[PDB]
Amino acid sequence: TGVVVDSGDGVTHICPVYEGFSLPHLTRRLDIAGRDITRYLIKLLLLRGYAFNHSADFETVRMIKEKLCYVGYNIEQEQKLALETTVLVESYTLPDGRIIKVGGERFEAPEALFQPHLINVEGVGVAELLFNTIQAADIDTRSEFYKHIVLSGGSTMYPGLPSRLERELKQLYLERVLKGDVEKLSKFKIRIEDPPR
Amino acid sequence: AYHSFLVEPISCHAWNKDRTQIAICPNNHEVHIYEKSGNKWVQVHELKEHNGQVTGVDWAPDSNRIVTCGTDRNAYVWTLKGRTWKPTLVILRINRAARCVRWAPNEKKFAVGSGSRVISICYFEQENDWWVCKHIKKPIRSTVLSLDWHPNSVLLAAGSCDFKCRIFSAYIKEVEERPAPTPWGSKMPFGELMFESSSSCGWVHGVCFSANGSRVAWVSHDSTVCLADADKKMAVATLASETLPLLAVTFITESSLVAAGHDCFPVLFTYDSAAGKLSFGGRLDVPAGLDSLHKNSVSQISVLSGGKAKCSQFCTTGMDGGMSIWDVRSLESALKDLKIV
Amino acid sequence: FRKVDVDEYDENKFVDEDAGPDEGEVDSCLRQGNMTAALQAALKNPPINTKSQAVKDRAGSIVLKVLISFKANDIEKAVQSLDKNGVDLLMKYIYKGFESPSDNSSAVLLQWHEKALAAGGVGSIVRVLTARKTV
Amino acid sequence: PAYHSSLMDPDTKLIGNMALLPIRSQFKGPAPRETKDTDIVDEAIYYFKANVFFKNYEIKNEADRTLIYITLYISECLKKLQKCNSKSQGEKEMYTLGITNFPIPGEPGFPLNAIYAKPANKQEDEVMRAYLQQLRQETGLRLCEKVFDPQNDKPSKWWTCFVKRQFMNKSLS
């Protein structure tokens, strides 16, 4: 009886299920999924000097995304790595033999899931949306939901996604539930699923 | 005797019971099993299932089963069916990378250390037909780097990034039963902390139990080697090396340890039970731009034959992609001033 | 809401398990030519556990003072009169010296480093890096 | 691309898999009588200077093989014609060249053996052989007229220039 965060290619959904069925009420939807990230990568890769046409290279960038993109944990941190070092740079070979290099865009592209305005979408970010979806739900069932969030979908495989959500939900809680009691944060039990299959 | 399987590191290795085949991880998500033909090495197998770099490999002697753990958080138990090894997924219930794994001597269970700051003890339930595990958590504060079982398949030694060498009880009652009293203690309920080193420096890169398990040794990043025997109130002997950190260690007799690491060559350490002191009678690899057989750090060492009680041959795989077989007696002939025990 | 480092309150974080020579004695030997005795005197009871950055430096200065009074050719002798644990503590002190260049001190410390390195080996340095409790 | 023959009819006979096309000539051979004012030898000479530069050529009719043959033969004539002085000398030079027994399809020496079928029996052989010699005769003759400027003893440099070039990088020598 837990909440499922299923993000595939077309759209991302947050579905709370209780002891058997999904409650159409409370369920939400974010207009930012797999494809949106792929297209966002293309934009980032053009600003870097690579000639990617949105319609002719979509499939190509998608593979770049799937092989190289990941979710940053602490963006300010991920940013410093990209600007101060070269540990993030990876070489990718395109269908024509040309070899491009990808760095900061590896985490920047997926950051859209958390910051929609980046791809000019009005919203709050799958994370903050996951918080509001349960903080509205029954006050008895909450603790259980918070500890049964399972990730589903192709676009939920980004390395470090689970850890990001957990850091986000924790951040919201500390401000929108504990008001700022650092000492009570320890009681916030958050267990995000993410199974192999 | 040196052989280069590749130029990239060999993350870890494991040999079958007869020492006929060896399984290594060539810095991959894969495990390659090699076999000797005449005086050459022929790749006979490829185990492709992990989705991250394989960090630990162990081979149960008698059941001929292979266990592997990876950075993808998974753990697989490989069984041989005809001419192909089939993997069975084992859920460690961890959210960080698995760093090491070892079969218990009784082969009824295995332990996996991970970045989740816990040790997953796995055993199979012939009722629901699958593998389950129980966690040893307290007081592990960091990543578990290495593991080594006690001859009784219950006690377990673990080395971690919180600078501590520990021995816990991994007592599962549903596969074995009531461990006989040991010098380490009489009460061994699951997870019980039996011993913990006192040093507050250096990651414990490798740990090892002696043949009778009454002594345990470990090598830390602060270039020290240590030994503690339960027959002397768990008194610990410490030796500060003058060289680079050691990454792997094993007993070759009850009073002799052979280690290797960043210097790239194996060394010898002997223990004086009487004085409770450790000594260095090292350097077994006596004569790129180095004078050692291995060109990069040695990260694993295993007893090939003769057990840990009277080892005649041992193996070393390293970050140079090399595997080296050493003959304990040949080393004693070449170095007439060498001890052992 | 992201300006807060929740990790700082994570109960899986790490926490380490949380003094000084004797001037009168050290100065005694110093103003007596007994260099080798001055060294050992200063190398005794390092503030390895006191929180005060002050008492630590108080000790580092006294040690540094001795290393300076030393004459180029009198080092090896006083370096070889220490037990491996001493050479170790010396090496930790030499590096703390490197952090406060002054005159030719930073040049003499380089001579010591050379001596201590031959005596204690590169592992005496490794132990400077790995120390959690230090000078 | 290259230029192909348009003299192929549904009622055109074959010798091997070459087209036994009509030719306006006073030379003897199995060649049919000609009705139209232009034969297969006219095309070859008309298209020569252009065709000679092509390296690849697609065969569309058995007619193209006869075209190809004549084209390759012109290259042989020019090699000879180049080094002689006077239209007359050149006419004698061309009788001799057309009388020499060149390699026919099927024998080593003949290039393009993978494209030309060899005479199926001894009769075809005699005919094919007689036909090709016919063309060599009636080709080196006309060619002799085109090559020499009304200022005899002058093999037009507008023909001598194609001496080093080979149609389809092939040669009858």
Partner: protein, 397 residues
């Protein structure tokens, strides 16, 4: 746009076109070469010449820094720029924004090397590295009434010919295609034809003569045999004469100019005449590229095939290309109605007067507009954000 016009430089394989924005023609078109001496002490680095002044120089060695549009020698390219600025343009680099061009598929790293030179060495206040195809399309607005930055650009210079599809100002990299035939190949082919027929041509002037013949007499014909026949018939109205001076003896040598007039450019449509490794007719290559592009942009492409470069100046070049490309398309759309009614395809090859320096011209025009100073990366941004900013250049116009 301030008092002084921006500097515009199109560095090509064979020729560098340079000048000031707003002008219709480059103020200088010079060979892309630098002659040097060969541990450098003193100022030996300054001892050099470029352009014509460097092609022969007795005691100096001629070097060509640009191979196929790409910069192979940055040390030399940088010095070349030293004289482009202070000797020819006589511009105080710190006072003018600069618009430099780049080969298609130039890497992002190269743009940085170029920017390092312009900001670290010459201290330019602003820089813009343009994509030649875009400038060419802009130059075509000159005509042949509705501006657009979507089209197929056929740039044929001296190195290699490029067929570059452009959608709304952005090159479709994954679909670019090359053709091993360019200006230098046509010259070289004409040289052979001349060696095979005309005596008296000075060996050490074989290419020079061919080049002059290529630029003063060549053209593209509609049909080979018919062209060949015309010459062999009315020879007096087609064969031309050319006379030159022997660099030695200074004696006048004259020759006849014939078939090469149309055979030279002909290799664009029948590559096999002079190349053993390439055979695709340029018309097909154009077809092939447009076919590989996004279906929905294919029509826009066929309707705007623009020409650019010295080697596209041959008379009727665009006519022959259009016709040939139409045949291939039309024939292809025939097998459909047959196999099965696809709306017809409108193929249009645009030729305009500015073609020869299409790239520089388009560049001069765009650098004359106010938007140019908005899209250039300023020196300040260069120092505060870093060379990375020069990897991307906002398309505009």
């Amino acid at each position: 746009a301030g008092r002084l016009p921006a500097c515009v430089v199109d560095c090509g394989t064979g020729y560098t076109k340079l000048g000031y924005a707003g002008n219709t023609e480059p103020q200088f078109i010079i060979p892309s070469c630098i002659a040097i001496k060969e541990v450098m002490k003193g100022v030996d680095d300054l001892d050099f010449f470029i352009g014509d002044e460097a092609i022969e120089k007795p005691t100096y060695a001629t070097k060509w820094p640009i191979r196929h549009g790409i910069v192979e020698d940055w040390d030399l390219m940088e010095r070349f720029m030293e004289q482009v600025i202070f000797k020819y343009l006589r511009a105080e680099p710190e006072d003018h924004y600069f618009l430099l061009t780049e080969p298609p598929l130039n890497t992002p790293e190269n743009r940085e090397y170029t920017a390092e030179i312009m900001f670290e060495s010459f201290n330019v206040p602003g820089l813009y590295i343009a994509v030649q195809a875009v400038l060419a399309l802009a130059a075509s607005w000159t005509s042949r009434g509705e501006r657009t930055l979507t089209g197929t650009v056929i740039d044929s210079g001296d190195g290699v010919t490029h067929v570059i599809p452009v959608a709304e100002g952005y090159v479709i990299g994954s679909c670019i295609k090359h053709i091993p035939i360019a200006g230098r190949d046509i010259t070289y082919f004409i040289q052979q034809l001349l060696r095979d027929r005309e005596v008296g041509i000075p060996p050490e002037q074989s290419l020079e003569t061919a080049k002059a013949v290529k630029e003063r007499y060549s053209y593209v014909c509609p049909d080979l045999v018919k062209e060949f026949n015309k010459y062999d018939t009315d020879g007096s109205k087609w064969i031309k004469q050319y006379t030159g001076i022997n660099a030695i003896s200074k004696k006048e040598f004259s020759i006849d100019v014939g078939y090469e007039r149309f055979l030279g450019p002909e290799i664009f449509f029948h590559p096999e005449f002079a190349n053993p490794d390439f055979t695709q007719p340029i018309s097909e290559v154009v077809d092939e590229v447009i076919q590989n592009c996004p279906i929905d942009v294919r029509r826009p492409l066929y309707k705007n095939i623009v020409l650019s470069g010295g080697s596209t100046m041959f008379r009727d070049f665009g006519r022959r290309l259009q016709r040939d490309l139409k045949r291939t398309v039309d024939a292809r759309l025939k097998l459909s109605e047959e196999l099965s009614k696809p709306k017809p395809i409108d193929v249009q090859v645009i030729t305009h007067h500015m073609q020869r320096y299409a790239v520089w011209f388009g560049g001069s025009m765009l650098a004359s507009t106010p938007e140019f100073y908005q899209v250039c990366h300023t020196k300040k941004d260069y120092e505060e954000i870093g060379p990375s900013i020069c990897r991307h250049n906002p398309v505009f116009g």
